[PDB]
Design a binder for this molecule. Structure first.
Ligand SMILES: O=C1N2C=C(c3ccc(O)cc3)N=C(Cc3ccccc3)C2=N[C@@]1(Cc1ccc(O)cc1)OO
Ligand SMILES: [Ca+2]
Ligand SMILES: [Co+2]
Ligand SMILES: [Co+2]
Ligand SMILES: [K+]
Length: 187
């Protein structure tokens, strides 16, 4: 499968995918999120529960900051969904230009940081833990779906190169080959 490179930013399914994620981040239901909250979730919550080392936590935070700044987030800046989505259009565009130049993307680099906390492969049990800890996929069945969906290595583990290809399609281009990456956890 060739990763779908053309964007599809007006497709209701792409909007819905990010609306789901925004509302997931908007825990207090007030329609706005900040980079502060995202970084706290990354560092104070996820990395702590994963027992990341201090250096791994810091690297992961740099990647989360860069990723979400790429969608227009900033500390102290309260962003609502329409502006957030507009930021994702910009991030996707930028990321696809990097991909075309064979320059590591911000989604790759975030992946590298996540994978390194799990020791560039992750096992299904590690993915299940991530799903619960990050909250993106707390159903272990949806995590099993991710592994069924992806092309796995010879051990049945997931590699960051494959997850990055999947994430380009899932988060940026609405690639049909990426549908179902998170099972039913994320539409
Ligand atoms: O991709 C991922 N995410 C995308 C969004 C997200 C958020 C908003 C959107 O509109 C769309 C997507 N939110 C979270 C969860 C999270 C959010 C904030 C801080 C830390 C973690 C998240 N975790 C990741 C981490 C990851 C990255 C690359 C890999 O190869 C493997 C794992 O795997 O799912
Ligand atoms: Ca909020
Ligand atoms: Co490799
Ligand atoms: Co194979
Ligand atoms: K598979």
């Amino acid at each position: 499968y060739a990763v779908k490179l053309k964007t599809d930013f007006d497709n209701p399914r792409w909007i819905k995918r990010h609306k789901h994620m925004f509302d997931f981040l908007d825990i207090n239901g007030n329609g706005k999120i900040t980079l502060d909250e995202i970084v706290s979730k990354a560092s104070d919550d996820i990395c702590a529960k994963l027992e990341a080392t201090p250096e791994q936590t810091k690297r992961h935070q740099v990647c989360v900051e860069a990723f979400f700044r790429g969608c227009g987030m900033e500390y102290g800046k309260e962003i609502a969904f329409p502006q957030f989505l507009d930021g994702w259009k910009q991030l996707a565009t930028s990321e696809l230009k990097k991909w075309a130049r064979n320059e590591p993307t911000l989604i790759r680099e975030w992946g590298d940081a996540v994978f390194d906390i799990f020791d560039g492969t992750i096992t299904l049990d590690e993915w299940k833990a991530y799903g619960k800890i990050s909250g993106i996929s707390p159903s272990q069945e949806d995590c099993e779906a991710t592994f069924r969906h992806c092309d796995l290595d010879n051990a049945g583990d997931l590699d960051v190169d494959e997850m990055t290809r999947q994430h380009l399609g899932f988060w940026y281009t609405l690639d049909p080959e990426a549908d179902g990456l998170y099972g039913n956890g994320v539409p």
